[PDB]
Symmetry: C2
Subunit: 124 residues, 2 copies
């Protein structure tokens, strides 16, 4: 459970992103603004933009998939954290109860130690 | 933050085996170290001295364990706080990332619109 929660936290940390984002950011506005198509008046220009558009579709699809998967991992971690927190609360209150019991036990043993110091004087 | 939460979880985990073992040692103490009404059964000094040695060991074991356990409760309350804080931070990060994904889905939909329209525009060209 603890081992599982650690693996999840490490994985998420290790899942580059910034590089793919920068690649997408560097796309020119002509790939996403259909009002600019009127500037295309020959097939050479159309073909240049078409290549750029194709790359953009691949980059965004790959990246959107990656991001969506990370959200899923985060929702899963969130569920694991809530469950682990509820279990720790229960363990904590159990241990609080136990510490009181052991303090009482030590006080009884101390009472025996004290009373034995006196009892031993009455013996041969 | 994540690195800190991991260190805390590992540390706390490491204590637990040592804990159960010390608790078993305390459980094996005999009734005579904790029940003063039974002292009446001690009728010579040799028996008294044997019990006195055992009682001293018990006092040391319980005192050391009670100090250990109190420190562990502190560590657990701290971990509990760290978990609540980390959970709240993950909720915030999650909603930020949800927003960003919507923006990139919208961007892809625009690019798809351009692609479609360019395929058609190309047919009108010489």
């Amino acid at each position: 459970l603890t081992e599982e929660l650690i693996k999840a936290l490490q994985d998420l940390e290790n899942a580059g992103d910034a590089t793919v984002r920068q690649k997408i950011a560097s796309l020119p506005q002509e790939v996403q603004d259909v009002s600019l198509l009127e500037k295309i008046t020959d097939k050479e220009a159309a073909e240049r933009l078409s290549k750029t558009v194709d790359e953009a579709c691949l980059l965004l699809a790959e990246y959107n998939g990656r991001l969506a998967a990370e959200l899923e991992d985060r929702r899963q971690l969130a569920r694991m954290l809530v469950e682990y927190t509820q279990n720790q609360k229960d363990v904590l209150s159990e241990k609080e109860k136990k510490l009181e019991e052991y303090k009482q036990k030590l006080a009884r043993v101390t009472q025996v130690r004290k009373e034995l110091k006196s009892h031993i004087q009455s013996l041969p």
